[PDB]
Amino acid sequence: PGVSWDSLPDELLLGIFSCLCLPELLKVSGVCKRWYRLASDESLWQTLDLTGKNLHPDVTGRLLSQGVIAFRCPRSFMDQPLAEHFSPFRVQHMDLSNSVIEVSTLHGILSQCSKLQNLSLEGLRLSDPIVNTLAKNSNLVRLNLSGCSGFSEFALQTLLSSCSRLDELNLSWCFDFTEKHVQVAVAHVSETITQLNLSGYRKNLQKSDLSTLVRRCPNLVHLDLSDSVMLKNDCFQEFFQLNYLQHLSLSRCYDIIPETLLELGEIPTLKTLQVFGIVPDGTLQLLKEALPHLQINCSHFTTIARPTIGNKKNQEIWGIKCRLTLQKPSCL
Amino acid sequence: QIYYSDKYDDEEFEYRHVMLPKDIAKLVPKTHLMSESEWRNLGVQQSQGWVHYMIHEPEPHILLFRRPL
């Protein structure tokens, strides 16, 4: 050809590269040095979706170092030691729920993220240093920690004392939690939060902890307290003190007399009251019919600080769809 | 008509899988793994310590649980 196609303005090469898909974008990196340097551009890499993929730690480290603002990666298997340190990343939204990552590479990766805004570490084992380094963010609007473990009360105190802009916190079902952990959690959670999910602690939850939680934090909208065996019929005064509560979803609180639940119907702001496993048959219909503004026992699962919620096979984490993604098999 | 399978074992872990009826198998989430506060809402009645850890794509109506040993 008589036309110098290499003599192309970068604004056009980037434009044509924008239409290329992820599995093909690595192929054009080898055409020439000019195309190699422009292949790893910060404009192309802005939404990474490596869901359910086996990645070496160096690969994901380099990809993040290329500049990523959203890194979806549920159920991955990066389980090898880290080798080379990397410049600080810019990951604003992250998702590592139900992964296999070991603590060493988890510390190697999370030690560089200092501009985070959302996080989700559901089911992942942690340690003392990894919770301490999460205090560097201080901008975490949402934090998911359901199923986590491995940290002591001091790390939790540091984490909830440094991050003062939390909006949601799904701190639920951490099995190695004593009364000290729950006490520190209710004491040091910032007053700016609007939703909490301190569920599944049983004897470790006491009426005093609920009292200080409702006194310190006058902003709650969702207060799922599931499997709280020690929440008796006298604890409804604390919920009455709440003025912005909308979805209080108790569960299996066996010390709650079902009839007294009609008292909870006095709260004008209440919308839905999920109550499971304590109200028996016959009385459930009477309670539903005698409370004709509350959608009693309607929603089963929790939408609390969860990245992907729904039933339409959504692929967006907190309202952010991933543009550049590894295509799932759909050919015939 | 929920049927519970026999627990099997492995290194420091104990596994059990539960099959679901078609009435409540359509309510199972597909984009996340539930917690004990959520699958006890489905009607499952195991003991304490069972955490859902994987979802079988060919048979979504089978729930998998593992407990440390």
């Binding site: 065996v229 066996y254 496993g277 304590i278 | 519970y4 009645q45 195991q46 003991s47 304490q48």
Partner: peptide, 15 residues
């Protein structure tokens, strides 16, 4: 009565 299974219902049916 009172608590035939409630409170200790957290166990497999074993039927």
């Amino acid at each position: 009565d009172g608590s035939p299974n409630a409170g200790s219902v957290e166990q497999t049916p074993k039927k």
